[PDB]
Design a protein around this ligand. Sequence first.
Ligand code: SAH
Length: 270
Amino acid sequence: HMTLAKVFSQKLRELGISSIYIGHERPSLQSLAIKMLLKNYGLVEERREGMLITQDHGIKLISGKGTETSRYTFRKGGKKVSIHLPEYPKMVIDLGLFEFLNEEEKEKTLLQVDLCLSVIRKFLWDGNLTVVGKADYVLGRANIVQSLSLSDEDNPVILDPYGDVVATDQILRDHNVFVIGGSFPRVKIQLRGSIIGVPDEINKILEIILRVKELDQSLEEAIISLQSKSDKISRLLHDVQLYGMEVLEEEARWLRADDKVIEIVRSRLG
Ligand SMILES: Nc1ncnc2c1ncn2[C@@H]1O[C@H](CSCC[C@H](N)C(=O)O)[C@@H](O)[C@H]1O
């Protein structure tokens, strides 16, 4: 779809603005826009000089002292830019069954939901995240609702590792609402025919989907980038039981698996 950084940059050019003095802020449009949306930060109209730090989506981000010309500086208290924030995608986490679980289980689930905020703010913004079915929960500007209300422009899918619809670049790309649990299609992410090795963690699933949608990355590469040592180990082990040792070496270069992983997988066999 569109990242917050991209929408921000298109509005900025329209007005006529292609340089910002950022002073002491992380020099990324995403970060700057998030900050503007969440704090009293904004743009102040002032003429300043600097050197380039970067050229994000075509906008010269300035600081320090040099010879690059800013007409606008990003400052605590400046004026907001007004940007049609992307309605989509909407990432929904369902906490319906939440009080089936153990105390220790609830603390793990919620820690995982907490980390979603950081993922959502890496591409979109808090508004694109919704949590359903727990009303005392508060996660920055996430929507916190008791039940999910569907609109005509919503085209949703349920992420379910026991689903009957295998996920695909196109299927993730052609949908815009995604429900991840604590009557639409129930969609299962596999690695290469299998669910084994696929990260289990709510915040990792969410990040896999966004990588595919916002960065134009493949599902395979997305999954692999987000695996833990344990995901790789468990998958190599499985596949060596299946296909034998000839598989090990090459399937480790593909899983991008490091020495420690391969060491361990050897050590389990002999
Ligand atoms: N490989 C995968 N494919 C699709 N969805 C997944 C997935 N791994 C995790 N999820 C999502 O992450 C949530 C937490 S995993 C626990 C749910 C598990 N299906 C169960 O029945 O116990 C799941 O409900 C699912 O929404």
